[PDB]
Design a protein around this ligand. Structure first.
Ligand SMILES: [Mg+2]
Ligand SMILES: [Zn+2]
Lengths: 82, 25, 231, 673, 709, 58, 226
């Protein structure tokens, strides 16, 4: 019930926090996944596909963290608290 | 009453005459 | 002279009625120069028609509610005012809406004479109770832009809307071409009635504006100017 | 600025340049950046597409002094800033500077994009009142837009004998077109037929019935075109608001709008409110000139009358009836009244549309004391130490102060400027100690299950006006988790244990008539280390239950320290707070009753002897207090402030006998924790 | 003005005087004995408030050291012409009247009682006979800077203090214009400041040139006034003296001959006149920001020159003697294109940040030479060329022409410091326009920063097509309580338009007190309103309704001073009239070009291993404790660690992170801060065994070494 | 906070062995603060693609 | 009930540099927008010619003096900023200013080449004593708007060049006042009186014609959409 967001506020925050217990967990929940995505891009040249690349198709030169958040908003990721 | 000869004559609203001129600053 | 980057117009269609025309890039300061005049032309340049006067059969003191109808006189006036009518004759033409018996009266129940037409038969005008009736004589005239009610026997002049486009809004945003980060980006936004599509309304506004500035151009057709160039 | 951005994002730029093959070696890329070839700029626009940066304005004073913004390129050499975040930063664009850091690691960016983003910090941590809202120029725009001036063009006129009712417009689009042509003023009572705006509850329940309004139902709104345009800014589904937009009204609207809607909606609506405010401020005819600054119609009469009274006192003192101190007190009192009367007359004279009054009455800025210091009477002025000067300043800043009255005026201003630096230093010191003592308090658990919580009076009951809301209920029992179920006088309950007291629940409790409610608090938390989430309760900035791991010690310390720079003065200013937290013996020590009894007070010079006879027997405690300060109201059945410590009046245990301030240690001993 | 006020300063701190900490608040206050001896308005706003003042205009210092002040005695209730200087001690005994008190033409006190200043800061009416002394002029209590703020009687002390302290920060422009409205102190302050050259004796100017002017005295003796052009002042701003007189024109002794910086016809002029409109415009002037027409940028209204001095010296080292020369190791001929034969850039060469100004080579002959390196030298026959190249270069952010260069050489016995032979200093001049971030301010303490510079067509324009050249927000006028600037704007317009008081039916009542020669003024007239005695409210209201019509025959501003403006963008008139007039706007020296820093990576310290750099890299920005608290409050643990460990102290971290960012690799984990290790290795030196224990109570050996690659 | 020489002398005599589990102490040695994203609950979360998404990727 | 009359434009010449154009009838509430649209494009989109760089013998930069002139190089540059020229050719052309001996040097002493002229010869540029002489070689180009002097800073010419800010704008002041004819009956229209004043470089008629041409071509992009 609002107009389309633009910039780094997309995806919205309230939608994300419904998928995480508290925002302190979300930041790590998105930062670690970004590290795996960035590792895969470096390893994309040659190696083992241990760290799967981005799940949702990335846009034109989308930052790894931005991709990490977009796929989290799509419920294509899971984690376990410590 | 301009002390310096070549002064630009700017009419002033002053209403009280000054009895003492400004000293060498 | 010549343009650094030719402006181009890309249409967006949010709905059948609405649109978000975007003109980019523009030389610094031309954003508003287009926007304001273009909006004013769109709002009050395109010809159209709409009801101009209404005569209810039984109302002599206007304020009195018409017998047999739940809706008041003012509500009837408001409902008829929003009616969308397209006319093709300059002379005013009368129309008659008659109904008898319980039920509801909609814009599709008015018989239009030759030429005039109605573009929203599904609009609701009022409801008639048991053994209810109403005959209303409404005149339709062709004009341009919003005009307040004219004329200050039992006539009830109403504020007419001679315009197929009823709301417009524009904005100007910053944009960079190579490293100027100053070029204006006009973002128009027009919603019209069902009579005229946004594309045609904007095209007619542009045509009228070009014709109007043709007067200034004609003063001297040799002066050097600012040329966008062929597409 | 596009120069700082390049020199700041350089290693990222160099990497991308080699990626596009503009340069082959890093050394080639570095040199290209140094020379600033035209190719670098196109890449730079792409390197900072979604890369947040941190802006900080020293002295950072509270949590909202470092925020993360998405950068945008712009010409020039100045860091453009949003108008709304100026209040949080306390920044004024008159030469101020702020640093720009840059998060590097993937985790550093994620924090500066999810925790510090300016769009996520609308509400201040100290209290729920929003900190980013129409503040200075926007408020004047909205107050002008929504005002309903009577007797204006295109006003709704009842139908005459023949002329039907005029001013009824089918839809806002028609009203706007009429406004552009020039037959309707943006602020004039009309009856539009709105089609997409949720009506107010009063009209919704009647015209529609409690069946559910939907977008597409027409209702007749008796309002002004301005209020209709304003309501289009608020998100769809927010009921139509049809009252003038004073400063306080907007704060309530935003609070009510952030208490129910997701934060993304609050950020967007606040922008649209800002955009409308600036646009309509310009078209509001707010200016200043000698015509717009009027003087009271009769000021000589008031001055002459009060001058005569002063002359009467002066003659009386000259005769020797009064001493120097009494003459000063008499003069100060009459001039205080004289200033009040002139202020009263000045207010009575100015019209409501005057720009000077519209900028203060609209809550945009200022207060009426300044508006009388200008065009009215400056009033009494302070001497170098603080004592009011008997001679007043009977000239406003419009008609021009005389030489002597201007020199006397300078005493206060210099003292104020010199004192400002001291207050800032004290505030910084106080904040440092509070942060150092409370750094350990951190939310560890989610619920300690403790059964003991404080009891806080929700609303005092009176024989007439059964429920009178407590004046300080919005900061006492407004964001606390309930401790025990609220049992009504009947056998049912209104709110249950574990609920989070907000506006709805607190309203329901008031309706039921509950006054005393036991609410869980951090003062009684049973957790061994830190505190638990439930006891601490709702967080202010977040708006929901506090998150495990957040540092509530620092937030509390900075919230106390922030206002320290804007409050001024037994002491009652910033030193009072500093004295109170340090737990030192108050300057004006006041004895506290050790046991209920009847006060057999005896008055003696150079030392007051206060003796109280206990109501249960025992020895009479002796207090050889000084004979200087005052007595204090006794706690009789009336408990009125006009009452005195009458001999023989019963008092409770642990009650203050005379003016001043009780010693915290003494109350701890006699009363308890 | 800044020079003049500095000489008049009255410092309170320093050797033999109270320090800042020892200076109790009681000494920073104002005392009733400052009236006429030390201005109460002018003083630094920073911590040094009250410890620094300024002599009043009339104050004089008696031989012992006590500051005197003139008064004119009253023999018997009648004012007297002769004056007597009185110090504080002699003031208390007597009774001092006030200057503004009305007096009859013969000296009789018209009133029965007059406001008086009694022994100790006490003021009360007294019989006209008891008065013993009277002031000389109402402007006696104000310093030089504060004496040239028109309508100072309408401002508050705070604003006037800022207004006084900003006239000493103005910057001389290319072309200076005398203010339309300004007090009489303008002329005298300029003459006595020493900037202008004043003819010593009467004569007729035989020849005048842009460099020198020679005046032919009446005694037949010639004198030549050499006047400096484009000479760098102490703080950077340029100084010029352009003659105003013409050949064959008689000049009387004491007249001004040439105008130094900030001077026009011999009267101080620190700024320009701008057509102000007071209204909030689209938020671009929100909260003290300012909006400027593009006319100021394109017509050089507020353009200023600034001179920078760079100097390098050649000193004899142990290895050898440093020499400035045109040959440098391994540099292209293009980079050395502008260098002259001597090795120093030629006059008129446009330099930028990084170019070589002085070609300096230092000897490295007695330095270790790698076996492979000297083998390479023999292989090509390449010259050993041990000499390094510590060549002077333009520090980052500097540009502009090279106006002049001076070279001091010991070979010609120029008296250089011991140890140096060649010392060349190069002056580079840049012409700065006005852009976003620069600070402007009026004379009433109304500061601001240039929020936006709109094109000329976007500015609101009067009905006659004139576009307003500046816009000021109206929310900051009443709250700050400096209504004086509104009064200045009104009187400014009346002075610019020119007025003609209706005299056919006699002088209107409000104009009775106006001097008979002030009833008619031509357009662009100049007027003066001396402080504490000037235009009254009634007078301004009268003049505003008597302004002359425009050349088109229409009066723009109405009787209230407001005018109907047309919107520049929308094109439709604003619904209500707005104020318009000419306000005198200076240009303060807190320019944006000076305040701009950025640092991706640069030189580091030696003891602390922290960022720092002398304009080669701007240097880092401190991240204090208060910022650390803010980061902790957010719960941002990772960001705080980066700001302290990886990018401030962790040496191996800094190298690794810069290699990771340049490549695509993720930024690695931070290490142990160098600050902690230094603290540990310096706490151990006091014989305090410090161990970093771990789980199991076992010490962790903090020393560690790993070889990358 | 107070005279450094006195406190250092007192700590040395008593051989104090304080722990590094406080905001101010952890900041000095450069390890993640024990508040916010530094606590054990949040710092050691393992994030992996869900089986359905990985199955539907290849 | 349409105002079938199409608008018409009539020009009144108050002075050689100033003219008034009357346009009517227009639609109500529309005159103001049309007038502003012309004003905005008249002050920023009218092509013209103006000096671009000057070269003074014996002068290496603009912060100096040339013997015999009463004013330094900076002031003479400012004096030349007011010079108005019309250049028929669309290439950088050159003009020379040679004067010697006592007297004043005015803009009329320049000797423009073919296709260039100076429209206010009476301007005062500098004053000369008998001792010195002035020799200025300056360039003229055709452009529009306002180009900062930095344009010639990076051209990489000799040290002698002295770049000068260029102001290609003949228009000086533009104003309009709409005379509404609204009446109680709905026969309302507007009139536009576009007063325009020029720097004497071009007649007002050319200035308005060029402004009209630019808008006509610029609104063509709206027309072509369809
Ligand atoms: Mg500030
Ligand atoms: Zn708890």
């Amino acid at each position: 019930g609002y107009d389309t967001p633009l910039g780094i506020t997309n995806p919205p925050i309230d939608e994300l926090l419904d998928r995480v217990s508290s925002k302190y967990a979300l930041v790590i929940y998105a930062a670690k996944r970004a590290r795996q995505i960035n590792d895969y891009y470096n390893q994309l040249g040659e190696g083992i596909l241990e760290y799967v690349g981005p799940l949702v198709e990335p846009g034109l030169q989308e930052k790894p963290l931005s991709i990490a958040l977009r796929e989290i908003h799509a419920d294509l990721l899971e984690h376990t608290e410590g | 009453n301009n002390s310096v000869p070549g002064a630009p004559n700017r009419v002033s609203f002053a209403k009280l005459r000054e009895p003492l001129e400004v000293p060498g600053l | 002279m010549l343009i650094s980057q030719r402006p181009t117009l890309s249409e967006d269609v949010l709905t059948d009625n609405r649109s978000q025309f975007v003109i980019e890039p523009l030389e610094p300061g031309f954003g508003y120069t287009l926007g304001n005049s273009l909006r004013r032309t769109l709002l009050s340049s395109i010809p159209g028609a709409a009801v101009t006067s209404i005569r209810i059969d039984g109302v002599l003191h206007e304020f009195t509610t018409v017998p047999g109808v739940k809706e008041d006189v003012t509500e009837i006036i408001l409902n008829l005012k929003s009616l969308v009518v397209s006319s093709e004759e300059d002379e005013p033409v009368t129309m008659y809406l008659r109904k008898q018996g319980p039920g509801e009266v909609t814009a599709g129940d008015i018989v239009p004479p030759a030429g005039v037409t109605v573009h929203n038969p599904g609009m609701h005008i009022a409801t008639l109770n048991d053994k209810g009736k109403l005959e209303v004589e409404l005149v339709v005239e062709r004009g341009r832009g919003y005009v307040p009610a004219v004329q200050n026997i039992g006539r009830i002049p109403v504020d007419s809307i001679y315009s197929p486009v009823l709301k417009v809004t524009y904005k100007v945003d910053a944009t960079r071409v190579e490293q100027r980060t100053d070029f204006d980006k006009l973002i128009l936004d027009v919603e019209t009635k069902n009579s005229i599509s946004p594309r045609d309304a904007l095209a007619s506004a542009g045509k009228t504006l070009v014709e109007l500035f043709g007067l200034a151009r004609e003063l001297n057709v040799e002066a050097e100017g600012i040329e966008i160039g062929p597409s | 600025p596009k120069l700082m951005a390049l020199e700041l994002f350089k290693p990222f730029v160099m990497k991308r340049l080699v990626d596009l093959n503009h340069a082959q070696n890093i050394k080639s890329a570095k040199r290209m950046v140094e020379r600033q070839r035209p190719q670098v700029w196109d890449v730079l626009e792409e390197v900072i597409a979604e890369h947040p940066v941190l802006l900080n304005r020293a002295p950072t004073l509270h949590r909202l002094g470092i925020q993360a913004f998405e950068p945008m390129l712009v010409e020039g050499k100045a860091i453009q800033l949003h108008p709304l975040v100026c209040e949080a930063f306390n920044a004024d664009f008159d030469g101020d500077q702020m640093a720009v850091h840059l998060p590097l690691s993937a985790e550093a960016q994620a924090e500066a994009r999810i925790l510090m983003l300016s769009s996520n910090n609308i509400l201040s941590p100290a209290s729920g009142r929003p900190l980013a809202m129409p503040r200075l120029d926007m408020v004047t725009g909205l107050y002008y837009l929504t005002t309903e001036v009577p007797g204006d063009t295109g006003e709704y006129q009842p139908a005459s004998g023949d002329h039907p009712e005029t001013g009824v417009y089918s839809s806002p689009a028609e009203a706007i077109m009429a406004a552009d042509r020039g037959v309707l003023s943006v602020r004039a009572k009309i009856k539009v037929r709105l089609t997409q705006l949720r009506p107010p509850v009063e009209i919704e329940a009647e015209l529609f019935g409690h069946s559910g309004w939907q977008p597409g139902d027409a209702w007749m709104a008796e309002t002004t075109l301005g209020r209709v345009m304003f309501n289009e800014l608020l998100p769809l589904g927010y009921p139509f608001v049809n009252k003038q937009m004073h400063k306080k009204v907007q704060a309530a609207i935003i609070n009510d709008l952030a208490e129910r809607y997701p934060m993304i909606v609050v950020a967007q609506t606040v922008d649209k409110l800002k955009d409308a405010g600036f646009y309509w401020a310009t078209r509001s005819g707010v200016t200043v000139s000698m015509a717009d600054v009027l003087v009271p119609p009769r000021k000589k009469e008031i001055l002459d009358h009060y001058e005569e009274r002063a002359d009467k006192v002066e003659k009386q003192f000259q005769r020797g009836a009064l001493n120097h101190d009494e003459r000063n007190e008499a003069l100060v009192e009459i001039w205080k009244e004289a200033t009040d009367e002139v202020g009263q007359a000045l207010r009575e004279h100015y019209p409501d549309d005057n720009p000077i009054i519209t900028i203060v009455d609209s809550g945009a800025t200022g207060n009426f004391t300044q508006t009388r210091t200008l065009a009215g009477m400056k009033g009494l002025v302070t001497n170098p130490k603080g004592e009011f000067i008997p001679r007043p300043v009977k000239s406003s800043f419009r008609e021009g102060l005389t030489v002597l009255e201007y020199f006397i005026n300078t005493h206060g201003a210099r003292k104020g400027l010199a004192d400002t630096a001291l207050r800032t230093a004290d505030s910084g010191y106080l904040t440092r100690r509070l942060v150092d003592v409370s750094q350990d308090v951190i939310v560890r658990e989610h619920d300690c299950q403790t059964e003991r919580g404080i009891v806080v009076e929700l609303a005092e009951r009176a024989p007439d006006g059964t429920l009178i809301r407590d004046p300080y209920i919005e900061t006492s029992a407004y964001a606390r988790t309930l401790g025990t179920d609220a049992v009504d006088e009947a056998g049912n309950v209104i709110v249950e244990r574990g609920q989070d007291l907000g506006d709805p629940e607190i309203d329901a409790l008031l309706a039921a008539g509950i006054t005393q409610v036991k609410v869980r608090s951090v003062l009684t938390c049973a957790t061994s280390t830190g505190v638990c989430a439930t006891c601490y309760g709702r967080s202010m900035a977040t708006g929901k239950l506090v998150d495990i791991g957040e540092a509530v010690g620092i937030v509390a310390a900075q919230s106390i320290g922030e206002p320290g720079t804007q409050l001024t003065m037994i002491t009652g200013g910033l030193p009072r707070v500093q004295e109170l937290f340090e737990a030192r013996v108050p300057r004006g020590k006041a004895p506290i009753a050790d046991v209920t009894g009847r006060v057999r007070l005896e008055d003696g010079e150079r030392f007051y002897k206060i003796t109280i006879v206990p109501d249960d027997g025992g020895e009479e405690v002796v207090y050889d207090k000084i004979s200087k300060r005052q007595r204090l109201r006794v706690f009789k059945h009336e408990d009125g402030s006009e009452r005195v410590l009458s001999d023989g009046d019963h008092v409770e245990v642990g009650q203050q006998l005379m003016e001043g301030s009780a010693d915290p240690h003494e109350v701890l001993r006699v009363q308890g924790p | 003005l800044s020079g003049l006020t500095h000489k008049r300063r009255l410092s309170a701190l320093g050797p033999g005087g109270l320090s800042r900490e020892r200076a109790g608040l009681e000494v920073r206050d104002v005392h009733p004995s400052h009236y006429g001896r030390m201005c109460p308005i002018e003083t630094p706003e920073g911590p040094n408030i009250g410890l620094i003042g300024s002599l009043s205009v009339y104050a004089r210092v008696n031989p012992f050291g006590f500051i005197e002040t003139p008064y004119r005695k009253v023999v018997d209730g009648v004012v007297s012409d002769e004056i007597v200087y009185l110090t504080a001690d002699e003031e208390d005994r007597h009774v001092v009247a006030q200057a503004n008190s009305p007096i009859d033409a013969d000296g009789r006190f018209v009133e029965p009682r007059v406001l008086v200043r009694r022994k100790a800061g006490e003021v009360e009416y007294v019989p006209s006979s008891e008065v013993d002394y009277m002031d000389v002029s109402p402007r006696q209590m104000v310093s030089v800077a504060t004496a040239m703020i028109p309508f100072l009687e309408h401002d508050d002390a705070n604003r006037a203090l800022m207004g006084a302290n900003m006239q000493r920060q103005a910057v001389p422009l290319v072309r200076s214009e005398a203010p339309l409205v300004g007090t009489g102190m303008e002329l005298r302050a300029a003459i006595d400041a020493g900037d202008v050259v004043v003819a010593e004796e009467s004569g007729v100017i035989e020849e005048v040139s842009a460099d020198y002017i020679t005046v032919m005295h009446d005694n037949g003796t010639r004198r030549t006034y050499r006047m400096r052009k484009f000479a760098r002042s102490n703080h950077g701003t340029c100084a010029n003296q352009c003659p105003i007189v013409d050949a064959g024109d008689r000049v009387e002794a004491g007249q001004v001959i040439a105008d130094g910086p900030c001077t026009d016809d011999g009267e101080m002029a620190l700024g320009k006149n701008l057509l102000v409109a007071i209204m909030p415009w689209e938020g671009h002037n929100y909260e003290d920001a300012i909006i400027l027409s593009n006319r100021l940028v394109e017509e050089d209204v507020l353009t200023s020159i600034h001179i920078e001095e760079h100097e390098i010296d050649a000193r004899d080292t142990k290895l050898g003697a440093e020499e400035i020369t045109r040959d440098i190791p391994n540099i292209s001929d293009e980079v050395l294109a502008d260098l002259d034969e001597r090795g120093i850039v030629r006059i008129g060469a446009e330099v930028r940040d990084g170019d070589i100004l002085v070609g300096k080579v230092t000897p490295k002959g007695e330095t270790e030479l790698t076996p492979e390196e000297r083998l390479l030298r023999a292989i090509f026959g390449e010259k050993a060329r041990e000499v390094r190249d510590t060549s002077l270069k333009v520090p980052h952010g500097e540009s502009g022409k090279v106006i002049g260069i001076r070279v001091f050489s010991r070979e010609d016995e120029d008296e250089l410091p011991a140890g140096v032979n060649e010392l060349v200093r190069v002056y580079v001049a840049q012409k700065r326009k006005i852009s976003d971030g620069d600070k402007l301010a009026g004379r009433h303490g109304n500061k601001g920063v240039i929020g936006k510079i709109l094109p000329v067509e976007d500015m609101p324009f009067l009905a006659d097509g004139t576009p307003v050249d500046i816009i000021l927000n109206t929310h900051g006028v009443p709250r700050r309580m400096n209504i004086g600037q509104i009064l200045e704007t009104h009187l400014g317009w009346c002075a610019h338009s020119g007025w003609k008081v209706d005299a056919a039916k006699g002088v209107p009542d409000w104009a009775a007190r106006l001097p008979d020669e002030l009833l008619e003024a031509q357009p662009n007239a100049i007027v003066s309103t001396p402080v504490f005695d000037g235009a009254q409210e009634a007078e301004l209201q009268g003049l505003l309704s008597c302004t002359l019509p425009n050349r088109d025959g229409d009066v723009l501003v109405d009787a209230d001073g407001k005018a109907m403006l047309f919107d520049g963008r929308s094109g439709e008139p604003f619904p209500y009239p707005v104020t318009v007039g000419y306000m005198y706007i200076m240009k303060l020296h807190h320019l944006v070009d000076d305040k701009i820093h950025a640092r991706s990576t640069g030189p580091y310290s030696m003891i602390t291993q922290q960022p720092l750099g002398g304009k080669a890299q701007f240097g880092g920005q401190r991240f204090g404790e208060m910022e650390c608290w803010a980061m902790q409050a957010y719960g941002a643990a990772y960001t705080l660690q980066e700001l302290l460990t990886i990018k401030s102290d962790d040496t191996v971290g800094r190298v690794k992170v810069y290699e990771a960012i340049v490549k695509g690799e993720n930024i690695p984990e931070p290490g142990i801060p160098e600050s902690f290790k230094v603290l540990l290795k310096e706490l151990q030196s006091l014989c305090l065994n410090v161990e970093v224990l771990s789980s199991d109570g076992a010490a962790i050996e903090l020393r560690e070494g790993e070889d990358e690659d | 906070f107070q005279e450094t020489t006195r406190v250092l002398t007192d700590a040395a005599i008593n051989c104090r062995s304080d722990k590094l589990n406080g905001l101010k102490e952890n900041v000095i040695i450069g390890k993640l603060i024990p508040a916010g994203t530094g606590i054990n609950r949040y710092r050691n979360i393992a994030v992996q693609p869900t089986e359905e998404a990985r199955a539907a990727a290849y």
